[PDB]
User: What shape does this take?
Amino acid sequence: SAVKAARYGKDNVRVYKVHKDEKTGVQTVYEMTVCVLLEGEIETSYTKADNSVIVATDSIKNTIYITAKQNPVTPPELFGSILGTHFIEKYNHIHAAHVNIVCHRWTRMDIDGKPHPHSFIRDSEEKRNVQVDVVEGKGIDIKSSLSGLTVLKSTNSQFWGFLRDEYTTLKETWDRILSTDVDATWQWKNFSGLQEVRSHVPKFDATWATAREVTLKTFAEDNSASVQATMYKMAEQILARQQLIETVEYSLPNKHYFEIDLSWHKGLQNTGKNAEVFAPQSDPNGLIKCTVGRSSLKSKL
Amino acid sequence: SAVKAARYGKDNVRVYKVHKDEKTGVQTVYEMTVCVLLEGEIETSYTKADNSVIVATDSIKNTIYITAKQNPVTPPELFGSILGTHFIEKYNHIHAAHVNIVCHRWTRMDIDGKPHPHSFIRDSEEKRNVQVDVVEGKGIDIKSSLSGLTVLKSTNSQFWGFLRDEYTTLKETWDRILSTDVDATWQWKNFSGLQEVRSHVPKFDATWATAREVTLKTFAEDNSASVQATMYKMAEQILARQQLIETVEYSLPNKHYFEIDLSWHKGLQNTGKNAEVFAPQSDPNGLIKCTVGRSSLKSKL
Amino acid sequence: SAVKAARYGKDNVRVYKVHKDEKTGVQTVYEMTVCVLLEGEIETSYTKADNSVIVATDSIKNTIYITAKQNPVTPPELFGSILGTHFIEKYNHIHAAHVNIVCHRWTRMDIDGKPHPHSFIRDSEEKRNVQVDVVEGKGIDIKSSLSGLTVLKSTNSQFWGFLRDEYTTLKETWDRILSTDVDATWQWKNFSGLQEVRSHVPKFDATWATAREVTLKTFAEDNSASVQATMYKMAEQILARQQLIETVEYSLPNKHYFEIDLSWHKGLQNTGKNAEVFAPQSDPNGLIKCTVGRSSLKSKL
Amino acid sequence: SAVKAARYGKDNVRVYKVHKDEKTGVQTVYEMTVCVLLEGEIETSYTKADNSVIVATDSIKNTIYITAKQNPVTPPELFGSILGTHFIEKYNHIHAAHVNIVCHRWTRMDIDGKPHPHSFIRDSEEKRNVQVDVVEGKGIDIKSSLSGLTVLKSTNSQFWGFLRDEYTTLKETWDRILSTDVDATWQWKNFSGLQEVRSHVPKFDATWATAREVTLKTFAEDNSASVQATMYKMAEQILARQQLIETVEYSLPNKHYFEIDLSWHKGLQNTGKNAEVFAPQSDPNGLIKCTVGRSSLKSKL
Ligand SMILES: *O([O])[C@@]12[N]C(=O)N([C])C1=NC(=O)[N]C2=O
Ligand SMILES: *O([O])[C@@]12[N]C(=O)N([C])C1=NC(=O)[N]C2=O
Ligand SMILES: *O([O])[C@@]12[N]C(=O)N([C])C1=NC(=O)[N]C2=O
Ligand SMILES: *O([O])[C@@]12[N]C(=O)N([C])C1=NC(=O)[N]C2=O
Assistant: This one.
């Protein structure tokens, strides 16, 4: 036998950081969950009980907290790049660091119409995430995402004109509920190293904000022909607004809300135009995915 | 043997309702999870295989949807009262109905600064709940609550002066993080029936809003001596603002954020006044409870 | 305002203990999650910022680990009684201790047909639990339970003869699937203190084993008329087999498996006698409860 | 813009099937959760609101149940292959089907020492899974796995000789607890189509059983130098026992159990040789991965 692939490290490292402005009194908090997995010349730890090649996962944990103490933790694209770069620079035999960060929301409270200097609310379980792959000799590859953004529209969604054969029971509809949990990912151009990442720092928060804005406005305003058609519109707009991202990926469940025929009970009308009460379905669910990039076709367009 | 207590029914009934204003185009959505459990002269279903006394749980489910079609689903205190009253009135041998409702958030989206007529966001997993116990001959007992309201303050929390003995290792502190998930319950005066509940309908939304407002403002503004002291202040204020509630209950976890001593690494200072990076602890957690009512002591106060 | 009820303590305290027989080499492991909440003369911690009356939750945590080091952790009824007794004896002003223990399964592995001396498998997420309420001057009240015991039978369950009215759509059936997650609780006679608990120690494991055995055999063998009828049979048998328990409680979901009519597709027959493929329903679910005790009726039986 | 990748279908489809032997009375149950995602000439559903190319997810759901009615659901490798093959054969424009199956345990109950003909227990949340990728013109690629197999050994695990630098605090140990949740995957040689899959049907259950047996015995018997070293031994043995699998992958968390120093309390000794009571850590956790294949090195071995 031989080792074909290996990576190891510390997962589920919860990290909080506070910034205190002593002049103004305003405090700002950040909370994340971090995973760092390393690759390199480590195969003998598996094959020969050679622990000399292992940077202990406990040490990786320590390093996450030390790096958070010594650097900004925002934007997460930067923090992840600093953290991954540390491992491949510090350890000659480590050649890749894979850093995943989930950022948790702590939104400043407004009390009596004024932002409070040191109190926060988890205003959504929506996350902002990064996946930062730092590969020695091959730069830094970053995927940024938002996830757990749960939305519903009560009309202006349709689904008709789909294939119908002997496996089909679904009725066409010109007016349905559409609800999803949005997972949207934008993948950046490869960066050559940490200096290039730093050179683009403002673009990270700006592009996350664009992605979120476009997602919400397109969902709300598109009289949707399908999940497929709507998500594509989102992706094409995000690509148009940031030239440093190469692709946009969406993964969207179709969280079904079924009509309830009540006509068996006193002739109650609760379908079609009279549909008011629905049964949300926990499972199963449609699942619709696509990755959108920029065109390179010049004929047969 | 004999049956000492029994109740049965349908749990986890997911319900959506939409209201459409055809004049304005504005749509409003409601989503809940409902449980209804019945009591009455049902013991022979357990002891004698007598199913004649069972209103099938499937029928209870149907009844939840029919009742939602024929009545408002808001405020949940009213919906639960209508629903519970139905069972004890319709079925002579059913003498209590226990209705639990969890209301899920669907907050209207603002798009380009304007409220959208038919698009919504799950802006928090915070819930608004009711427990409505409709007992034949003994009226309607309602407990209203908010739950899953997750908050954090980064300073202006203290904990010192606690008992110290041979089991104690905890350091006193004059400046710590305080974070919790708020579960707050207000219990209403007994109502004689559905007419009395209806007579107080506006008070339900108003009292939920007061409870939420008081919770947030007191959390944010109290330079807290303990979880105990802060929660008591919340409860006393809510009681002062609604004379139809008899008690207020809080159940609050103390979700610990531990300092991380980094002085072993290059003399890094990350404790006390220099504490910036903390380790959120998933478990264990303090758990602090109290039920507050109005005083009746006239001496030794 | 005044404090009407209060309790506080530490929740979610994970505890492992190992026993090592140095003569044989056999090791035995125990893992639990513990909650201890205290009551007593603590109201001034809420009303007056008086922390002197608070035994810190951190200290309660320490005490759980110290007590586990100094005593057996099995049976959990005993451990919980020792632990609760400690708080009301050690602290004059603490007058009740409420101890909840969830015991996690670590079943010894059999390797090549022989029990391994120090390797274990989580063979089920089924739990064994206790609730031990130690109340100064009023002894020790113990509720023991098993929970998360998930079972299914593919026939020999029926449900017919239930009430039928204008809310009813459910078809009678003489052959259905029955599946549940069993939560069964037995409540012991009040014990006067720790000596009386100790005097009955062997009965705890024996009664848990009886409850489990009776549950499984009755589920498997009863040609069930309803969940109600089957659960009652379980309870009556457990009461008959242990005179020191006063009541038995079951709480059982009816986890529905729906037939799927496929006759629209090539005349496929998949209902009634030809039902082979079913759709498990995640929600909603029936929920059926009862508490059974010993009879005291002497007439009209 | 253009579509670079797309797939869509139905997720979270719960499926039960029963087999009834009418001669013997013995019934056997199967329960799974299924996901099927399709690829093909579908880009215009995203770019042009062309629903004609969409086989509705609802129809995919119907097809899962129909296929389960008309075919064996075991082994899952076969069922997934039949199901995926159906989509690429039935629909000219569909060119890949990605089928994921999670199989849930229903183990026959033994009652009074005899296997019961129609009653079952969920004896573990451990799963058996498959990922079957059916790609037109490129056969069938199958990955089989077991997951959620939670184990612990109380001794005969070590971790010493790891890299030590200025980021390291971890103590070397020659005797620790080792606990994990095993996720083990074996990837089969590419199969040319459904006939080749069928030709190897007995190997699927046999190889799952080997993987499980090897996992448990190696975990129990290896005096482990590290998670890395132990998992490699598992993988090499599985490869040696089935020539039709090309690689074996393990993904193992190191679920830490920390010693508790109690020497501050009455000199209690609970470390090293006297360690009996430990604190299981929910997070963070080590995470150790490797993919093992057969060697092809002929020099510098
Ligand atoms: O995804 O869920 C489908 N299949 C289906 O049955 N639907 C009702 C869907 N709606 C869609 O928007 N697209 C789609 O492919
Ligand atoms: O609850 O968690 C405690 N015990 C304790 O150790 N603490 C740090 C606490 N803080 C409090 O506010 N109150 C309390 O009783
Ligand atoms: O509980 O789920 C019911 N109601 C119902 O509709 N059922 C199919 C049930 N089966 C039962 O065993 N009992 C019962 O009351
Ligand atoms: O993985 O958790 C480590 N790092 C570490 O700190 N450990 C205690 C580990 N034990 C291991 O078996 N391997 C490893 O790399």
User: Anything to note?
Assistant: Chain C has six helices and twelve strands.
